[PDB]
Amino acid sequence: MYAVFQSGGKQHRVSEGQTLRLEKLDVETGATVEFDKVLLVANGEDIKVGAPLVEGGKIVAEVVQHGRGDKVKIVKFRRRKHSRKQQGHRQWFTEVKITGINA
C-alpha cells in the first residue's frame, strides 16, 4: 500500500514505515504530523484517486529530525569582466517516518 501526498511544494509517493526528507516543517522533533492533502491511495488493485484530494485521506508520520542538507557552492563567474561571486547553501529539511496511511 502506498499513497501520494503534497508536502513542501512537492508530491511524495510514500508507503508505511518510509523515512523521507521534506521541506522544513514548523513542528518539533518526535511530533506526529498528519498530512491532509492526499492525492491518491492504492491498496493493491483498489485505487482511490482524489479530485483533487482523497476524501478521508490522512498520512500520519513522526518527525525524525530537522536538519541542514549537504552544502552546495554557488559560483558566479563573468569571464573577462572582473566579476566573480561565491555563496554557500545548506537547505533545511524535516525527516519524517510514515506511521500510517488512512484511505
Partner: protein, 116 residues
C-alpha cells in the same frame, strides 16, 4: 612589520587543489589550471542545478507518454484528461506509477479518458 605570505598562501592553493581531485593532468596538480577548472565546475554546477529540473521533467513526460500510449491515450490528451478530472498528480509521481504500478496508471488513464 613585515608579513611573510607562505602559510596562508599555501592554504588557499591547497583548498583549490583539494576541490580539483579527480581532474585530468594539470587540472588536479597545478594551481593555475586547477583554479580555472574548479571555477568552471562551479559554473556548470549552477547551470545544471537549473537544467536538472528540466531534464528530469522531460524524462517523466517521455515515460508518461509511453505508458499512456500503451493504455491508448497520448501524453497531451492524458494531461488534459487529468486536469479536467481535477487530478493533480505531478509528472514525477505519474512517471513513478507508470513504472512501478502499471495497473494504477491504467486506472488514471481510464479516468483521464472519461474526462475528455
Amino acid at each position: 612589520p613585515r608579513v611573510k605570505r607562505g602559510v596562508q598562501a599555501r592554504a588557499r592553493h591547497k583548498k583549490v587543489l583539494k576541490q580539483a581531485k579527480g581532474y585530468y593532468g594539470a587540472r588536479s596538480r597545478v594551481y593555475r589550471v586547477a583554479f580555472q577548472a574548479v571555477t568552471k565546475a562551479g559554473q556548470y554546477a549552477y547551470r545544471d542545478r537549473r537544467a536538472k529540473k528540466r531534464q528530469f521533467r522531460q524524462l517523466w513526460i517521455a515515460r508518461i507518454n509511453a505508458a499512456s500510449r500503451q493504455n491508448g491515450l497520448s501524453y497531451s490528451r492524458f494531461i488534459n484528461g487529468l486536469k479536467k478530472a481535477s487530478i493533480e498528480i505531478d509528472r514525477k509521481i505519474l512517471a513513478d506509477i507508470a513504472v512501478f504500478d502499471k495497473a494504477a496508471f491504467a486506472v488514471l488513464v481510464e479516468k483521464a479518458k472519461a474526462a475528455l
